[PDB]
Structures are given as structure tokens and as C-alpha cells.
CSV table of C-alpha atoms and ligand atoms in Angstrom, one decimal:
chain,number,residue,atom,x,y,z
A,1,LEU,CA,7.8,45.1,-23.1
A,2,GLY,CA,4.9,43.4,-25.0
A,3,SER,CA,6.7,40.1,-25.4
A,4,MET,CA,3.9,38.3,-23.2
A,5,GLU,CA,0.9,39.8,-25.0
A,6,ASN,CA,0.8,36.5,-26.9
A,7,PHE,CA,-0.4,34.6,-23.7
A,8,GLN,CA,-3.8,34.7,-22.1
A,9,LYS,CA,-3.7,33.6,-18.5
A,10,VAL,CA,-6.6,31.2,-17.8
A,11,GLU,CA,-6.0,30.4,-14.2
A,12,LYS,CA,-3.4,30.4,-11.5
A,13,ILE,CA,-2.2,26.9,-10.7
A,14,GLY,CA,0.8,27.4,-8.4
A,15,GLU,CA,2.7,29.8,-6.3
A,16,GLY,CA,6.2,29.0,-5.2
A,17,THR,CA,8.7,30.7,-2.9
A,18,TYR,CA,10.1,32.6,-6.0
A,19,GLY,CA,7.5,32.1,-8.8
A,20,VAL,CA,3.9,31.9,-9.8
A,21,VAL,CA,2.5,29.5,-12.4
A,22,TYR,CA,-0.5,30.0,-14.6
A,23,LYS,CA,-2.3,27.9,-17.0
A,24,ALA,CA,-2.2,30.0,-20.2
A,25,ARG,CA,-3.2,30.0,-23.8
A,26,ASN,CA,-1.0,31.3,-26.7
A,27,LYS,CA,-3.4,33.7,-28.4
A,28,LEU,CA,-1.7,33.3,-31.8
A,29,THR,CA,-1.2,29.5,-31.8
A,30,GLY,CA,-3.9,28.3,-29.4
A,31,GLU,CA,-1.5,26.1,-27.4
A,32,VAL,CA,-2.3,25.6,-23.8
A,33,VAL,CA,0.8,25.9,-21.6
A,34,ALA,CA,2.0,26.4,-18.1
A,35,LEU,CA,3.6,29.8,-17.6
A,36,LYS,CA,6.0,30.4,-14.7
A,37,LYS,CA,6.5,34.0,-13.7
A,38,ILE,CA,9.7,34.9,-11.8
A,39,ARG,CA,9.9,38.5,-10.4
A,40,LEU,CA,13.3,40.1,-10.8
A,47,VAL,CA,18.7,37.1,-14.0
A,48,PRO,CA,22.2,36.1,-12.9
A,49,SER,CA,23.8,35.0,-16.1
A,50,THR,CA,24.7,31.8,-14.2
A,51,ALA,CA,20.9,31.2,-14.0
A,52,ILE,CA,20.6,32.2,-17.7
A,53,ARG,CA,22.8,29.2,-18.6
A,54,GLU,CA,21.4,26.7,-16.1
A,55,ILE,CA,18.0,27.4,-17.6
A,56,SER,CA,19.4,27.2,-21.1
A,57,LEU,CA,20.7,23.7,-20.4
A,58,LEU,CA,17.3,22.7,-19.0
A,59,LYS,CA,15.8,23.7,-22.3
A,60,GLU,CA,18.0,21.0,-24.0
A,61,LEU,CA,17.2,18.4,-21.3
A,62,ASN,CA,14.3,16.8,-23.3
A,63,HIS,CA,12.9,13.4,-22.3
A,64,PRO,CA,9.4,11.8,-22.4
A,65,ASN,CA,9.3,11.9,-18.6
A,66,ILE,CA,10.4,15.5,-18.2
A,67,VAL,CA,7.9,18.4,-18.5
A,68,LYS,CA,9.1,20.2,-21.6
A,69,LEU,CA,10.4,23.7,-21.3
A,70,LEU,CA,9.1,25.4,-24.4
A,71,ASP,CA,10.6,28.9,-24.2
A,72,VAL,CA,12.1,31.4,-21.8
A,73,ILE,CA,11.1,35.1,-22.2
A,74,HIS,CA,12.6,38.1,-20.3
A,75,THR,CA,10.3,41.2,-20.2
A,76,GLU,CA,9.8,44.1,-17.7
A,77,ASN,CA,10.9,43.1,-14.2
A,78,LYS,CA,9.8,39.5,-15.0
A,79,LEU,CA,11.3,36.2,-16.4
A,80,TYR,CA,8.7,33.9,-18.0
A,81,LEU,CA,9.3,30.1,-18.5
A,82,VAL,CA,6.8,28.5,-20.9
A,83,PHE,CA,6.2,24.8,-20.1
A,84,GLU,CA,4.1,21.9,-21.4
A,85,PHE,CA,0.9,21.7,-19.5
A,86,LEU,CA,-0.4,18.5,-17.7
A,87,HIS,CA,-3.8,18.3,-16.1
A,88,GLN,CA,-3.1,16.6,-12.8
A,89,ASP,CA,-0.2,15.9,-10.3
A,90,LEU,CA,0.5,12.8,-8.3
A,91,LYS,CA,-0.7,14.4,-5.0
A,92,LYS,CA,-4.2,15.0,-6.4
A,93,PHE,CA,-4.3,11.5,-7.9
A,94,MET,CA,-3.1,9.9,-4.7
A,95,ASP,CA,-5.8,11.8,-2.8
A,96,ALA,CA,-8.5,10.6,-5.3
A,97,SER,CA,-7.1,7.1,-4.9
A,98,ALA,CA,-6.7,7.0,-1.2
A,99,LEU,CA,-9.6,4.7,-0.2
A,100,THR,CA,-8.4,2.0,-2.6
A,101,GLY,CA,-4.8,3.0,-3.0
A,102,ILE,CA,-3.0,3.3,-6.4
A,103,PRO,CA,-2.8,-0.3,-7.8
A,104,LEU,CA,0.7,-1.7,-7.4
A,105,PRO,CA,1.2,-2.1,-11.2
A,106,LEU,CA,0.5,1.6,-11.7
A,107,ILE,CA,2.9,2.5,-8.8
A,108,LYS,CA,5.5,0.3,-10.4
A,109,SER,CA,5.0,2.0,-13.8
A,110,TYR,CA,5.2,5.5,-12.4
A,111,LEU,CA,8.3,4.6,-10.3
A,112,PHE,CA,10.0,3.0,-13.4
A,113,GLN,CA,9.2,6.0,-15.6
A,114,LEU,CA,10.6,8.5,-13.0
A,115,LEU,CA,13.7,6.4,-12.7
A,116,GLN,CA,14.1,6.6,-16.4
A,117,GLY,CA,13.7,10.4,-16.3
A,118,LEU,CA,16.2,10.6,-13.4
A,119,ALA,CA,18.7,8.3,-15.2
A,120,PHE,CA,18.5,10.6,-18.1
A,121,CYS,CA,19.0,13.9,-16.3
A,122,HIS,CA,21.6,12.4,-13.9
A,123,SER,CA,23.6,11.1,-16.9
A,124,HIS,CA,23.8,14.8,-17.8
A,125,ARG,CA,24.8,15.8,-14.3
A,126,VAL,CA,21.5,17.6,-13.8
A,127,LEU,CA,19.8,17.3,-10.4
A,128,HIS,CA,16.1,17.9,-9.7
A,129,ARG,CA,16.7,18.8,-6.0
A,130,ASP,CA,13.1,19.1,-5.1
A,131,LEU,CA,11.2,16.0,-6.0
A,132,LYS,CA,7.7,15.8,-4.4
A,133,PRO,CA,4.3,14.5,-5.4
A,134,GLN,CA,3.1,17.9,-6.6
A,135,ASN,CA,6.1,18.1,-8.9
A,136,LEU,CA,5.2,14.8,-10.6
A,137,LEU,CA,2.6,15.4,-13.3
A,138,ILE,CA,0.5,12.7,-14.9
A,139,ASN,CA,-1.6,12.4,-18.1
A,140,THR,CA,-4.4,10.2,-19.4
A,141,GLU,CA,-2.0,7.9,-21.3
A,142,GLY,CA,-0.3,6.6,-18.1
A,143,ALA,CA,2.8,8.8,-18.3
A,144,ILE,CA,4.3,10.6,-15.4
A,145,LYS,CA,6.8,13.5,-15.7
A,146,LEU,CA,9.3,15.4,-13.6
A,147,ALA,CA,8.3,19.1,-13.3
A,148,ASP,CA,9.9,22.3,-11.9
A,149,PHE,CA,13.5,21.4,-11.6
A,150,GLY,CA,15.4,23.3,-8.9
A,151,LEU,CA,18.4,25.4,-9.8
A,152,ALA,CA,21.7,25.2,-7.8
A,153,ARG,CA,21.0,28.8,-6.6
A,154,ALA,CA,17.6,30.5,-6.5
A,155,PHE,CA,16.9,34.0,-7.7
A,156,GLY,CA,14.2,36.6,-8.0
A,157,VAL,CA,11.8,38.3,-5.6
A,158,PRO,CA,10.1,36.0,-3.0
A,159,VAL,CA,6.4,35.9,-3.5
A,160,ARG,CA,4.9,37.7,-0.5
A,161,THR,CA,1.6,35.9,-0.7
A,162,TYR,CA,3.3,32.5,-0.6
A,163,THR,CA,1.6,30.1,1.9
A,164,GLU,CA,3.7,27.6,3.8
A,165,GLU,CA,3.3,24.0,2.5
A,166,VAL,CA,3.5,21.1,5.0
A,167,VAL,CA,5.2,18.9,2.5
A,168,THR,CA,8.3,21.2,2.0
A,169,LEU,CA,10.9,19.1,3.9
A,170,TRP,CA,9.3,15.6,3.7
A,171,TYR,CA,11.4,14.4,0.8
A,172,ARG,CA,14.8,16.0,1.6
A,173,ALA,CA,17.8,13.7,1.7
A,174,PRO,CA,19.7,13.5,5.0
A,175,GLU,CA,23.0,14.8,3.5
A,176,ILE,CA,21.1,18.1,2.6
A,177,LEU,CA,19.7,18.3,6.1
A,178,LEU,CA,23.1,17.7,7.6
A,179,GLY,CA,24.6,20.7,5.7
A,180,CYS,CA,26.3,19.0,2.7
A,181,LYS,CA,27.3,21.8,0.2
A,182,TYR,CA,28.0,19.7,-2.8
A,183,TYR,CA,25.4,17.0,-2.8
A,184,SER,CA,24.9,14.6,-5.6
A,185,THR,CA,22.3,12.9,-7.8
A,186,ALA,CA,21.6,10.7,-4.8
A,187,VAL,CA,19.4,13.4,-3.3
A,188,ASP,CA,16.8,12.7,-6.0
A,189,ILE,CA,16.9,9.0,-5.4
A,190,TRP,CA,16.1,9.6,-1.7
A,191,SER,CA,13.2,11.8,-2.6
A,192,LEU,CA,11.8,9.4,-5.1
A,193,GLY,CA,12.1,6.6,-2.5
A,194,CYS,CA,10.1,8.6,0.0
A,195,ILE,CA,7.5,9.2,-2.7
A,196,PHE,CA,7.5,5.4,-3.6
A,197,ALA,CA,6.8,4.6,0.1
A,198,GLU,CA,3.9,7.2,0.1
A,199,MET,CA,2.2,5.7,-3.0
A,200,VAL,CA,2.3,2.3,-1.4
A,201,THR,CA,1.2,3.2,2.2
A,202,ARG,CA,-1.0,6.3,1.5
A,203,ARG,CA,0.9,8.2,4.2
A,204,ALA,CA,4.0,10.3,3.9
A,205,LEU,CA,7.1,8.5,5.0
A,206,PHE,CA,8.9,11.2,6.9
A,207,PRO,CA,6.5,14.2,7.5
A,208,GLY,CA,8.7,16.6,9.4
A,209,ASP,CA,7.7,20.2,10.1
A,210,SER,CA,11.2,21.5,10.8
A,211,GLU,CA,14.7,20.6,9.7
A,212,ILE,CA,15.5,18.9,13.0
A,213,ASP,CA,12.1,17.2,13.2
A,214,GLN,CA,12.7,15.9,9.6
A,215,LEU,CA,16.1,14.6,10.6
A,216,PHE,CA,14.8,13.0,13.8
A,217,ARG,CA,11.9,11.4,12.0
A,218,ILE,CA,14.4,9.8,9.5
A,219,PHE,CA,16.6,8.8,12.4
A,220,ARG,CA,13.8,7.2,14.4
A,221,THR,CA,12.9,5.0,11.5
A,222,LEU,CA,16.2,4.1,9.8
A,223,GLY,CA,18.3,4.5,13.0
A,224,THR,CA,20.6,7.4,13.9
A,225,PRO,CA,23.5,7.2,11.4
A,226,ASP,CA,27.1,6.7,12.5
A,227,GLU,CA,30.5,6.1,10.9
A,228,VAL,CA,29.6,2.4,10.6
A,229,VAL,CA,26.8,2.8,8.0
A,230,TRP,CA,27.7,6.3,6.8
A,231,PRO,CA,31.5,7.0,6.8
A,232,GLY,CA,32.1,10.7,7.1
A,233,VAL,CA,28.7,11.5,8.6
A,234,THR,CA,30.1,12.7,11.9
A,235,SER,CA,32.2,15.4,10.2
A,236,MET,CA,29.2,16.8,8.2
A,237,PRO,CA,28.7,20.6,8.9
A,238,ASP,CA,25.4,20.2,10.9
A,239,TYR,CA,26.0,16.8,12.5
A,240,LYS,CA,26.0,17.0,16.3
A,241,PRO,CA,27.4,14.3,18.6
A,242,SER,CA,24.4,15.1,20.9
A,243,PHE,CA,21.9,13.7,18.3
A,244,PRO,CA,19.8,11.0,20.1
A,245,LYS,CA,20.8,7.4,19.2
A,246,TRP,CA,17.7,5.6,17.9
A,247,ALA,CA,17.8,2.0,16.7
A,248,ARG,CA,16.6,1.1,13.3
A,249,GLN,CA,13.2,-0.4,12.7
A,250,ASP,CA,12.4,-3.1,10.2
A,251,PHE,CA,11.1,-2.0,6.8
A,252,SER,CA,8.4,-4.7,7.2
A,253,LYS,CA,6.9,-2.2,9.7
A,254,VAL,CA,7.6,0.7,7.4
A,255,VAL,CA,5.8,0.0,4.1
A,256,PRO,CA,3.5,-3.0,4.7
A,257,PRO,CA,2.2,-4.8,2.6
A,258,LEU,CA,4.8,-4.1,-0.1
A,259,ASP,CA,6.5,-7.3,-1.4
A,260,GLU,CA,10.1,-8.1,-0.9
A,261,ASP,CA,11.2,-7.0,-4.3
A,262,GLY,CA,9.8,-3.5,-3.6
A,263,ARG,CA,11.0,-3.4,0.0
A,264,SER,CA,14.5,-4.3,-1.3
A,265,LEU,CA,14.5,-1.6,-3.8
A,266,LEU,CA,13.1,1.0,-1.4
A,267,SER,CA,15.8,0.1,1.2
A,268,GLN,CA,18.5,0.7,-1.4
A,269,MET,CA,16.9,4.1,-2.4
A,270,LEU,CA,17.0,5.1,1.3
A,271,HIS,CA,20.6,4.2,2.1
A,272,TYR,CA,22.2,6.9,4.4
A,273,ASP,CA,25.5,6.9,2.5
A,274,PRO,CA,25.0,8.8,-0.8
A,275,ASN,CA,27.7,6.5,-2.2
A,276,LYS,CA,25.8,3.3,-1.3
A,277,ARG,CA,22.4,4.6,-2.4
A,278,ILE,CA,21.3,3.0,-5.6
A,279,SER,CA,21.6,5.0,-8.8
A,280,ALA,CA,18.6,5.5,-11.1
A,281,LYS,CA,20.2,3.4,-13.8
A,282,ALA,CA,20.9,0.5,-11.4
A,283,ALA,CA,17.4,0.8,-10.0
A,284,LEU,CA,15.9,0.2,-13.5
A,285,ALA,CA,17.6,-3.2,-13.4
A,286,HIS,CA,16.1,-4.2,-10.0
A,287,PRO,CA,14.1,-7.4,-10.0
A,288,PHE,CA,11.1,-5.3,-8.8
A,289,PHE,CA,10.7,-4.2,-12.5
A,290,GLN,CA,10.8,-7.7,-14.0
A,291,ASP,CA,7.0,-7.5,-14.6
A,292,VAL,CA,6.7,-3.8,-15.1
A,293,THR,CA,3.8,-2.7,-17.4
A,294,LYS,CA,2.2,0.6,-18.4
A,295,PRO,CA,-1.4,0.8,-17.1
A,296,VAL,CA,-3.6,3.8,-17.8
A,297,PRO,CA,-5.1,5.5,-14.7
A,298,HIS,CA,-8.7,6.7,-14.3
A,299,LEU,CA,-8.3,10.5,-14.0
A,300,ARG,CA,-11.1,12.8,-13.2
A,301,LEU,CA,-10.2,16.1,-14.9
B,401,LIG,C1,2.1,22.7,-7.4
B,401,LIG,N1,2.8,23.4,-8.3
B,401,LIG,C2,1.9,24.0,-9.4
B,401,LIG,C3,2.9,24.5,-10.5
B,401,LIG,C4,3.0,23.2,-11.2
B,401,LIG,N2,3.7,23.2,-12.5
B,401,LIG,C5,4.9,23.7,-12.7
B,401,LIG,O1,5.5,24.1,-11.7
B,401,LIG,C6,5.5,23.6,-13.9
B,401,LIG,C7,6.9,24.1,-14.1
B,401,LIG,N3,7.9,24.5,-14.3
B,401,LIG,C8,4.8,23.2,-15.0
B,401,LIG,C9,3.5,22.7,-14.8
B,401,LIG,C10,2.8,22.3,-15.9
B,401,LIG,N4,1.6,21.9,-15.8
B,401,LIG,C11,1.0,21.9,-14.5
B,401,LIG,N5,-0.4,21.5,-14.3
B,401,LIG,C12,-1.1,21.6,-13.1
B,401,LIG,C13,-0.6,20.4,-12.3
B,401,LIG,C14,-1.4,20.2,-11.0
B,401,LIG,N6,-2.8,20.4,-11.2
B,401,LIG,S1,-3.9,19.6,-10.2
B,401,LIG,C15,-3.7,20.4,-8.5
B,401,LIG,O2,-3.6,18.2,-10.0
B,401,LIG,O3,-5.2,19.8,-10.6
B,401,LIG,C16,-3.3,21.5,-12.0
B,401,LIG,C17,-2.6,21.5,-13.4
B,401,LIG,N7,1.7,22.3,-13.5
B,401,LIG,C18,3.0,22.8,-13.6
B,401,LIG,C19,3.6,22.1,-10.4
B,401,LIG,C20,3.8,22.5,-8.9
């Protein structure tokens, strides 16, 4: 008891399947933080979270402290004022300028290269989990654990975006998926920044799969060896032919289209790694612009 009395909740800024997130102020120190409340900790989670506390990087939202009290587990995070969804909405008539898209993509590939080099997966990359500040930085937020825990929040409202960034190996039942799942998600987000429309906006697992298939072609053993033995693969899947990326993310230039196509390879072993993507010619002229944020 009493270990949270040091935090004044200022406003609720998120509700997940398994947690709620507040903007909060430390009453002793005055720091403004994000507090995630999880209602009850498998020791396995105790150590997954402990390793995240050591996973410190300029493009990862810092986990400041973990506090266990009552029937609750509190995670204290660095606070940022806006996420990429809100910024993309505010930017929609114009679109985010390409140099800023490129900066954000580059930074997130750096953050991913870092956490992948430590065998840590995000697992749930999406615009609302990408937080931005006034200095042009963008940071990865709310890493997903390999197994959830806690009490589902009963007031949780379904979000349309939940499946839109899921890699095809996850949708097909892969149990031991790899860092490639994050590269897929980030490529979907890259496409969305460029076009101002979600790339694959499915509302069910099969709708998501079929939206991917209708654009990239139904995968087979030619392009994805082993796909036909995946747990949820069905020979009865419709066979759609691939479309050209030129139709998928116009008016993106060939350097960007090239990189995107490698981020969206079906085969997780052919999909580009974060480290390799950082060397892609798309980033030869990368800079760090500062966005105009209305806070
Ligand atoms: C949508 N959901 C809300 C919880 C969010 N979140 C975490 O999960 C988290 C962890 N761990 C740490 C966070 C730190 N800071 C902020 N700041 C918010 C960002 C968005 N904005 S906003 C709509 O653009 O105005 C308000 C300020 N959010 C965090 C992200 C996902």
C-alpha cells in the first residue's frame, strides 16, 4: 500500500486491453510522467519487464520505474505530448513532408535495430504507439510482452486499427515469430504516412489476411517457402495476383518504394532487417526536420 501516493493523476490518456495509462505528476519531484496501471505478476513477466527497463535508447520511450502495490502493477514512463496518429490527422490535407517521413522512418529503424540486436520484439507497432516531440524525435512506446497478463479492462472500446499492422506470419499462426514482425508493421506505417490512408485496414483476422493477399498476391511456396505448412494456412485461400507498388503508394519515389517492398516481403527471412534498412539508398539524404506541433 501507499507506494503510489507520490503520483497525482492529471488525465487519462489511454486504455488498453490489459492496462490504463494516465498522465501523472510526481508530487515530490514535480516530474510529469505517463503511468500505466495493470490490474492483477507472473515472474516471467517480472523479468521481461526488468529487461525492458535496461533497453534504453533515444528512440524508445524510457521506462522510469515499476511499482507493485495492492492488486495493481504500475509502470512509470517518460511522457510525450503527441503520437503519430494525431500528427498524421493534423497533417492530412497537406501530408507529412517527405523529409520528415524519412527522418521518422530512419529514427524508428534505429530504435528497432537497437532492440532487435538485443532480441527484443515490439510486437504491436502502430501509429498511436509512436510518440513525437517538438525536437523532431519519434519514439517507440508500449512494447508488447511475449505473454500478456492481468485483468482485461472491461470498459475497453474496440479500436479499428488493431489488426492493420500485423505481419502475415502472425496471422497464419506462427508461434515463434521473429524481429521481422516489427519491420512489417513499420512498413505498413511508412506506407500510411506517405499515402494518408492505412495500407491494409482489415477488421477481422481473415479480412486482414485477404487484404494483404489482394495487394501483394496470395503467397505460395515460390515466394514464401514453408507458408503452406503454417498452422492457419488453408489451401482454399483465394489465389489473387500481385499488384504493382506503383499503384500502392503513389507518388513515393523509387528509393522509397524499393525500401517499402523489402519491408513487406512475405518470407520473414527475406524481409529486410532494421540494420540493413538503415543502409538503404532512400536514406542517403536523410535529415532531421522539426515538425509544427499543436499541443
Ligand atoms: C494510445 N495509447 C495511449 C497510451 C500511450 N502511452 C503509452 O502507452 C505509454 C507506455 N507504456 C507511454 C506513454 C507516454 N506518453 C504518452 N503521451 C500521450 C501520447 C498521445 N497523446 S495525443 C492522443 O497525441 O494527444 C496524448 C499524450 N502516451 C503513452 C500510447 C498508446
